Design an enzyme around this catalytic site. Structure first.
Site, PDB file in Angstrom:
ATOM      1  CG  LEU A   1     -35.069 -12.494 -95.640  1.00  0.00           C
ATOM      2  CD1 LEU A   1     -34.851 -11.515 -96.774  1.00  0.00           C
ATOM      3  CD2 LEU A   1     -35.706 -11.780 -94.476  1.00  0.00           C
ATOM      4  CG  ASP A   2     -32.613 -18.637 -96.630  1.00  0.00           C
ATOM      5  OD1 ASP A   2     -33.081 -19.158 -95.599  1.00  0.00           O
ATOM      6  OD2 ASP A   2     -32.646 -19.193 -97.747  1.00  0.00           O
ATOM      7  CB  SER A   3     -28.377 -15.478 -93.203  1.00  0.00           C
ATOM      8  OG  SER A   3     -27.848 -16.677 -93.752  1.00  0.00           O
TER       9      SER A   3
END
Lengths: 102, 176, 68, 459, 128, 87
Positions: F41-43
């Site tokens: 998942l993204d930051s």
């Protein structure tokens, strides 16, 4: 190549605690500290403070005060009894005067 | 302005603006469901342009984001009432008595609390017991001619405790 | 296992000074207040009488309170 | 009052031939005996003074100031150990006997008949304080402080002598009673203005007025604690005492040439209360506080009202007590942190939980909290000055606001909120320091109950 | 969207939008690195003065003592009489004094001439 | 003025509110599970996560510490450090 001095690194934190934690404020003789407790807590608070408080609580009529109270009471009773106006002006005699006339 | 480095990054600045803008939307946007709507609208706005390989485009959009954010911030945001700025801010600093004290007590008061004072005495013996060789050798071995950073490495070399630890460990409990 | 040792600075020196202060105001507070209570319960102040026909008294005995 | 003078001469050589570890108890006990002895005098009744063969008399212009000095002596003395404790026994005896001599000449100065004798005892007050503050001032410009002190007090006080010799050989002898009874007004010539300007200017320098108040703050930051309290309380209130004595003569021209001095003192009062807001060096805040209060005293003295003189002596006695106390707490803080600077020593709410109560009570007496006698003084001076000009009350109230502001800022800056967690050497406060606190403030409150004593001769 | 938020002597310009941050050069990063190194070395020396068990007294700050001596008695040198210093001292020293002295001339003249006439409220004006 | 906390209970609460989230899975979910490394998942969602921890536990964690946690163990350790909860 130079110092300009010779003296020692002095002083240190000579704590008045870490030797005598029962002791009071000043220096390292543990009897005369108790003697100082005695003299400044009997001769500053016991025999001076409350004695001076009771001395100033009542001393004689400083600046003639209660004398002035009772004398003013009796004089106003006088100047009611004789019908003349209380506190007439011209405290000095209006006849006993000499105006420099033109 | 941070202990690790000097530059944050472009990504770190974008991210801090993201957290601040989302917090300001929380403050604007009570009943929490319209908040969820507008927050995912904001998340959509930042995923408009995931594929940005340019750099001057990204930083110019970031500056316009600062413009469009300062155009619409909120005066009293909901800041958390334990943080600095908030409603507590060391509210219970009435009893954060520092712990170099509790060593100048009267010895009858020290007779009241025996075992805790024996344990504090052996902690203090541990403190002076492991100062010289470990901390001096680490603080002369690991630093370069400039130290040039603030986070410091532990005593990973051989043995006991990491250096420079006393006034970081023995702080008050924040509930005194 | 819940309770915690609170950290106070000290109590001994402060309570010792205030103990000595209350006891050494109390040391000659009780004799003075009890003695002046004995004065105004036994000896009385004075009366408001007047200077009689041809008499000259002291420069005291012009005052109400006897210790005055 | 020779029964006050000769025990002071019989107290000094006892300290000389006192043995080791026994100087202290002897001096303290016998000065407290002198305090009861001083309390015996308070007898001033009604119409006249209380006189005594030629040299001595007593008024309420002099009696509470004299009681203030002799009460201040043990307080002075017990502040004056632990910062010369490691010095020699002979130098310690020399210092204590110097303070006893200074007290002796102060009693000489307050119990004076002639203004010539007042001048002799005025610079007799001057001389020992020089040696004390310059020797034990404990900073690098105690030299400069003693030198400014001596040269301003001499160079102002000196033509006063020539004017007094002129009044001597124009009106016969110089009893205060003859000058009550042989005085006559001197009209608006020029030499009358010069003689009045010389006398009042000597006293102006002693006050200090705003034009020449750089005299004070070096001599307060660069002095030991005994000389600090003596300097501030007894020297400034001695200057005001001397002005109250001399101003009975030369009435008709003070309306013509008092207008610069009143103006200079008012605007300097505002500027000094502003300058003691923002400085460093915590000691000096109380120094300019004393400057501001004595400027208020000067305005009160020269506007010539009975309300003004009663409030003037009340403000003198109250500020002497409060400033001596607050100097002693400043010395306690300097014993703690070895700094003298304001922003370094911080916290002192967790630490020292009852020393803070004495800081609070001192700053509230300085603030003119309404049972403090400071407020009685300021209130009577405000009443008199609004009778004097009906518009100068704005400067008074602006002084009032700023006075409460800087005193309470001095409280909450160093002593409200957070230790710097690197001080780690303060011990809990000694019984000696707390003894000096309760020797300052208990007579202030017990005087605040029945304060009809301390008001002036125009009771 | 906005006139770009001018600062003032009071209105703080925050470090969000300078906008002059964004033209970073290599010498500016070198400057920020040197600033970080200076605070790093000063905090290192501070902690090593700060963490001994044998230390009892204060931390012995040189910066505060420097500022106090530079503010207290190192003001009188240096100093020179300029037009600015002399004019500003003469305008802040005797100006307000001569101003309120004129208004007290006016109010004392009014009070003197007024009760010289006799049209005051001194039917009873006791506390003189 | 006394809610007490534990380590195991507050770790269960943090793992609970991570399990509540939509576009991760409870299938492969544990305390030793890095966010950016191997959960993919993204930051951005990672800072939505730290936002959720702040919005539940009622204290701001600093922006320097919204950078370098990335795993639930260090989250539970950091919250236990800020709240000072040990025995």
């Amino acid at each position: 190549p130079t110092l300009r001095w010779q003296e020692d690194p002095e002083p240190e934190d000579e704590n008045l605690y870490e030797k005598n934690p029962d002791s009071h404020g000043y220096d390292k003789d543990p009897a005369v500290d108790v003697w100082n407790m005695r003299v400044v807590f009997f001769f500053g608070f016991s025999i001076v403070l409350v004695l001076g408080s009771t001395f100033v609580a009542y001393l004689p009529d400083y600046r003639m005060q209660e004398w002035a109270r009772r004398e003013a009471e009796r004089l106003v009773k006088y100047r009611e009894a004789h019908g003349l106006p209380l506190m007439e002006s011209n405290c000095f005699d209006p006849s006993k005067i000499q105006l420099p006339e033109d | 302005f941070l202990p690790s480095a000097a530059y944050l990054t472009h990504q770190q600045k974008v991210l801090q603006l993201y957290k601040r803008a989302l917090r300001h939307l929380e403050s604007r946007c009570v009943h929490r469901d319209k908040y969820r709507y507008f927050a995912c609208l904001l998340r959509a706005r930042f995923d408009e342009h995931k594929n940005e390989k340019d750099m001057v485009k990204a930083t110019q959009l970031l500056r316009e984001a600062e413009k469009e954010f300062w155009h619409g911030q909120h005066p009293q945001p909901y800041i958390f009432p334990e943080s600095p700025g908030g409603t507590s801010y060391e509210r219970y600093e009435c009893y954060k008595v520092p712990e170099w004290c509790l060593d100048d007590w009267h010895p009858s008061e020290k007779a009241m609390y025996p075992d805790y004072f024996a344990k504090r005495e052996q902690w203090k013996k541990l403190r002076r017991e492991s100062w010289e060789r470990e901390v001096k050798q680490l603080q002369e071995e690991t630093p370069v001619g400039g130290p040039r950073t603030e986070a410091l490495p532990p005593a990973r070399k051989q043995g006991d405790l990491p250096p420079l630890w006393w006034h970081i460990v023995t702080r008050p409990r924040e509930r005194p | 296992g819940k309770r915690l040792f609170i950290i106070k600075p000290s109590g001994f020196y402060d309570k010792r000074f205030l103990k000595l202060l209350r006891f050494y105001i109390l040391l000659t507070g009780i004799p003075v207040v009890i003695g002046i209570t004995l004065i105004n319960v036994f000896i009385g102040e004075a009366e408001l009488a007047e200077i009689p026909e041809g008499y000259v008294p002291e420069h005291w005995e012009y005052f109400k309170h006897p210790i005055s | 009052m020779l029964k006050y003078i000769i025990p002071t001469m019989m107290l000094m050589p006892l300290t000389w031939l006192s043995k080791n570890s026994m100087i202290w108890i002897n001096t303290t006990l016998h000065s407290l005996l002198i305090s009861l002895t001083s309390l015996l005098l308070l007898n001033q009744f009604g119409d006249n003074s209380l006189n005594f063969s030629l040299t001595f008399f007593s008024d309420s212009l002099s009696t509470p100031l004299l009681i203030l000095t002799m009460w201040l002596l043990p307080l002075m003395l017990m502040a004056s150990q632990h910062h010369l404790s490691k010095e020699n026994l002979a130098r310690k005896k020399l210092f204590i006997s110097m303070l006893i001599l200074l007290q002796l000449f102060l009693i000489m100065t307050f119990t004076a008949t002639e203004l010539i004798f007042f001048y002799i005892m005025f610079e007799a007050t001057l001389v020992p304080t020089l040696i004390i503050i310059t020797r034990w001032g404990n900073q690098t410009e105690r030299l400069n402080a003693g030198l400014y002190f001596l040269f301003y007090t001499l160079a102002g006080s000196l033509p006063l002598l020539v004017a007094l010799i002129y009044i001597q050989n124009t009106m016969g002898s110089l009893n205060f009673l003859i000058l009550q009874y042989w005085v006559q007004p001197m009209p608006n010539s020029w030499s009358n203005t010069f003689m009045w300007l010389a006398c009042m200017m000597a006293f102006m320098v002693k006050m200090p007025l705003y034009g020449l108040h750089l005299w004070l703050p070096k001599a307060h930051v660069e002095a030991p604690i005994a000389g600090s309290m003596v300097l501030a309380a007894i020297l400034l209130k001695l200057g005001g005492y001397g002005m109250m004595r001399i101003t009975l003569l030369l009435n008709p021209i003070t309306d013509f040439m008092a207008y610069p001095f009143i103006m200079l003192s008012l605007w300097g009062m505002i500027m000094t209360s502003s300058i003691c807001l923002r400085q460093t060096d915590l000691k000096s805040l109380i120094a300019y506080s004393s400057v501001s209060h004595m400027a208020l005293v000067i305005v009160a003295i020269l506007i010539q009202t009975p309300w003004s003189y009663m409030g003037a002596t009340a403000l003198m006695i109250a500020h002497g007590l409060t400033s001596s106390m607050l100097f002693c707490l400043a010395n306690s803080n300097y014993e703690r942190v070895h700094s003298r600077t304001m922003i370094l020593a911080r916290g002192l709410q967790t630490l020292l939980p009852l020393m803070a109560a004495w800081w609070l009570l001192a700053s509230l007496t300085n603030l003119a909290l309404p049972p403090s006698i400071n407020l009685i003084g300021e209130l009577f001076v405000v009443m008199s000055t609004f009778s004097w000009s009906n518009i100068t009350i704005i400067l008074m109230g602006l002084n009032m606001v700023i006075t409460a502001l800087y005193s309470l800022y001095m409280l909450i800056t160093t002593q409200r909120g957070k230790h710097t967690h690197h001080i780690n050497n303060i011990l809990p406060s000694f019984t000696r320091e707390n003894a000096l606190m309760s020797l300052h403030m208990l007579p202030l409150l017990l005087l605040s109950l029945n304060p009809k004593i301390i008001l002036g001769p125009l009771y | 969207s906005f006139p770009k938020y001018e600062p003032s002597r009071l209105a703080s310009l925050p470090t969000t939008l300078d906008p002059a941050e964004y033209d970073i050069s290599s010498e500016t990063r070198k400057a920020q690195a040197e600033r970080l190194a200076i605070r790093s070395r000063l905090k290192r020396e501070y902690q090593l003065q700060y963490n001994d068990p044998s230390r009892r007294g204060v931390v012995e700050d040189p910066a505060l003592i420097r500022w106090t001596c530079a503010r207290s008695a190192n003001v009188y040198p240096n100093f020179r009489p300029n037009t600015k210093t002399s004019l500003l001292g003469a305008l802040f020293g005797i100006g307000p004094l001569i101003f309120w002295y004129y208004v007290f001339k006016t109010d004392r003249d009014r009070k003197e001439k007024l009760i010289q006439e006799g049209k005051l409220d001194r039917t009873f004006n006791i506390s003189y | 003025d006394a809610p007490p906390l534990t380590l195991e209970g507050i770790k269960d609460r943090v793992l609970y509110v991570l399990k509540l989230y939509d576009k991760i899975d409870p299938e492969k979910l544990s305390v030793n599970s890095h966010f950016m490394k191997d959960l993919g998942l993204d930051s951005l969602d990672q800072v939505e996560i730290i936002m959720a921890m702040e919005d539940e536990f009622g204290f701001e964690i600093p922006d320097i510490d919204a950078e370098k946690l990335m795993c639930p163990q260090e989250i539970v350790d950091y919250i236990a450090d800020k709240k000072d909860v040990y025995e």
